[PDB]
Design a protein around this ligand. Structure first.
Ligand SMILES: Nc1nc2c(ncn2[C@@H]2O[C@H](COP(=O)(O)OP(=O)(O)NP(=O)(O)O)[C@@H](O)[C@H]2O)c(=O)[nH]1
Ligand SMILES: [Ca+2]
Ligand SMILES: [Ca+2]
Ligand SMILES: [Mg+2]
Ligand SMILES: [Mg+2]
Length: 166
């Protein structure tokens, strides 16, 4: 009944899990428990199509990243997440995109660049920098807050709409 396999990747602590939990369970996770690998499933209607989202939430911490490449292999589309108050996480996006291209053996994989924690005032990554990166990659850039839920549905549904153009 139409399934989309989405994978969420990016540096430790940027909010991958909080984003996923906000989408699937409609609440904010305030605490930080590092992820190894977790999956979620939810039936939703997107643009008039009932479908099943399978979301793989991956490790950002190098210590918990064992076998992440094996899980990413099945993904149909990827959210590449950084946090707008974490310059390193933005600088490291290229690594995740490279890893995606490797595991998929393609330079044409559906992706969305996500700048999370947009509720925070200590911004060090400006919108324009991220837009430029996204433009060079040929993908959309969307800002989100897992805390307020702003942009969360848009980020994931946009990724579905990208998969649908493939
Ligand atoms: N203000 C704010 N805090 C956020 C946001 N998203 C996540 N956080 C906070 O940042 C911390 C880490 O979030 P988490 O989702 O666990 O990050 P992660 O990217 O999944 N980490 P890991 O890679 O280790 O699994 C938590 O304390 C969480 O509440 C956001 O949009 N805004
Ligand atoms: Ca909470
Ligand atoms: Ca490969
Ligand atoms: Mg996590
Ligand atoms: Mg600057």
């Amino acid at each position: 009944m139409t399934e989309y396999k989405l994978v969420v990747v990016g540096a430790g602590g940027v909010g991958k899990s909080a984003l996923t939990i906000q989408l699937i369970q409609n609440h904010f996770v305030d605490e930080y428990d590092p992820t190894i690998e977790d999956s979620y499933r939810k039936q939703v209607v997107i643009d008039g199509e009932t479908c099943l989202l399978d979301i793989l939430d991956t490790a950002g911490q190098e210590e918990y990243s064992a076998m992440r490449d094996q899980y990413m292999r099945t993904g149909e589309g990827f959210l590449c997440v950084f946090a707008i108050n974490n310059t390193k996480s933005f600088e490291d996006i290229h690594q995740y995109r490279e890893q995606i291209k490797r595991v998929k053996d393609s330079d044409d994989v559906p992706m969305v660049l996500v700048g999370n924690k947009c509720d925070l005032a200590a911004r060090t990554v400006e919108s324009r920098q991220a837009q430029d990166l996204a433009r060079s990659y040929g993908i959309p850039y969307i800002e989100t807050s897992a805390k307020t839920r702003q942009g969360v549905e848009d980020a994931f549904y946009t990724l579905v709409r990208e998969i649908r153009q493939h």
